[PDB]
Scaffold this active site. Structure first.
Site, PDB file in Angstrom:
ATOM      1  N   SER A  48       1.783  -5.940  -9.296  1.00 18.14           N
ATOM      2  CA  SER A  48       1.390  -4.625  -8.748  1.00 18.14           C
ATOM      3  C   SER A  48       2.268  -3.440  -9.160  1.00 18.14           C
ATOM      4  O   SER A  48       1.920  -2.290  -8.889  1.00 18.14           O
ATOM      5  CB  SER A  48       1.201  -4.688  -7.243  1.00 18.14           C
ATOM      6  OG  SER A  48       0.124  -5.586  -6.980  1.00 18.14           O
ATOM      7  N   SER A  96      -0.881  -2.002  -1.938  1.00 20.69           N
ATOM      8  CA  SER A  96      -1.083  -2.795  -3.139  1.00 20.69           C
ATOM      9  C   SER A  96      -2.500  -3.366  -3.226  1.00 20.69           C
ATOM     10  O   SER A  96      -2.683  -4.575  -3.452  1.00 20.69           O
ATOM     11  CB  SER A  96      -0.056  -3.918  -3.187  1.00 20.69           C
ATOM     12  OG  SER A  96       0.390  -4.081  -4.503  1.00 20.69           O
ATOM     13  N   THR A 187       6.619  -2.208  -5.111  1.00 22.07           N
ATOM     14  CA  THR A 187       6.819  -3.653  -5.174  1.00 22.07           C
ATOM     15  C   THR A 187       5.779  -4.344  -6.067  1.00 22.07           C
ATOM     16  O   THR A 187       4.716  -3.796  -6.388  1.00 22.07           O
ATOM     17  CB  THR A 187       6.707  -4.280  -3.764  1.00 22.07           C
ATOM     18  OG1 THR A 187       5.511  -3.796  -3.151  1.00 22.07           O
ATOM     19  CG2 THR A 187       7.931  -3.894  -2.897  1.00 22.07           C
TER      20      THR A 187
END
Lengths: 243, 242
Positions: A48, A96, A187
């Site tokens: 991601s 995400s 992240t």
């Protein structure tokens, strides 16, 4: 610029029995430090973290209209309950939401996607594996060093994209705001090759300094995921950058 | 637009013995809610909330070069120690560095300043009182309703300024980030002309909604200042916004 290996952070990895790398670069001195020069150049699936260049390309190609675009949920079941709702660009990035970005990728298409990754010098620039899954299970790989180079270019508006589009993505990446500093970050968690790889990449604006960072680690199981942020956070706290 | 009184909010004020107003608008400023219809439209000195239009004008005129401008400290005394350092645009806004913005205002000058306040429909648009202090002790006045209109324009990139410059100032105004919500805001404290007024203005993005807000209150003394943020924060927490 320059990169130097250090040992002053090793304790943070060994305390958690983690195999990983942190790269931290100070903009003004054009100098990076890392606990592991070899791992810093190792190339992994971005997972991601690819939402950063994908968002920029989505905007640049007109697939994403502007920063106020709402990505509507069609009601069809998604892998995560938290993706089962309408999302803004920032919302989709922050949770995400892979299916939102898979659709973006499809609409961008292979030819344009390839072109932009070349312009961005993004990893090995290999989009083999399917237009909507190359960054998750395909051939695309990027190192921690390359991440920080890319992010510095974004910070400086130096990517081959409008300043407006770079600014839109930069605000979408804000994750912590304090009177003394601003953190932009993303992240990733790549589960499709072994060992699984956890990422945290971004930058910190602090006083008049800017610090670019990229962390990755082998993830033994899902309980280790919070270490993606906590290890580099402790490092940056000890360096006086955040907290 | 329309403005509708909500009686229940008054509780957060009376508990603290505060005279003030909160204006909150979901989606747009076409319909807003407030505790006090009259005060919602009453006009006060903006104090450091003026750093929002001032930063946009600084960028538009080229006085501020771009988002990476550093405002260099000359090493001479400034009124607060927190101002005695080089600052970015966000840093100068976040610490409310008056002297950095006084210098911007001087360089912008009266004619250009007047022009942009008219373009922005910014309060009474009256810059009398000195180019570097009109928002601190001059004749400039703006209401909570007009603050929300101005901030909605900024949010939508609809001010008479480049989209780039509006985005730059918007990023400098981020004060809280969470995966679910983002707050852009600015405090002010008008101290020189009575009654002293505390401000907190901004907007909150939650899920796919946006909420524009402006709060002001009479400030009896320094110890009451934190209420500028805590009263509207409590109201907004109670509405499920933050």
């Amino acid at each position: 610029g320059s990169i130097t290996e250090n040992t002053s952070w090793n304790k943070e990895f060994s305390a958690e029995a983690v195999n990983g790398v942190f790269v931290l670069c100070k903009s003004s001195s054009k100098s990076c430090a890392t606990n592991d020069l070899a791992r810093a150049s190792k190339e992994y699936l971005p997972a991601s973290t690819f939402k950063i260049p994908n968002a920029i390309i989505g905007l640049e190609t007109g697939v994403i209209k502007n920063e106020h675009q709402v990505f509507k949920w069609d009601g069809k079941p998604r892998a995560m309950k938290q993706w089962e709702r309408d999302l803004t660009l920032r919302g989709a990035i922050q949770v995400s939401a892979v299916p939102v970005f898979q659709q973006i990728a499809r609409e961008v298409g292979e030819v344009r996607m390839q072109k932009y990754l070349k312009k961005f010098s993004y990893g090995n620039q290999n989009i083999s594996g399917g237009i909507d899954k190359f960054w998750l299970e395909g051939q695309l790989r990027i190192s921690a060093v390359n991440q920080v180079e890319f992010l510095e270019s974004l910070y400086l508006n130096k990517l081959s994209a409008s300043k407006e589009n770079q600014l839109i993505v930069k605000e979408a990446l804000v994750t912590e705001a304090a009177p003394e500093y601003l953190v932009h970050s993303k992240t990733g968690y790549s589960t499709r090759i072994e060992p699984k790889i956890g990422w945290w990449v971004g930058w910190v604006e602090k006083e008049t300094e800017v610090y670019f960072f990229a962390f990755n680690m082998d993830i033994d199981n899902e309980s280790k995921l919070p270490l993606r942020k906590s290890i580099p956070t402790k490092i940056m706290e000890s360096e006086g950058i955040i907290g």
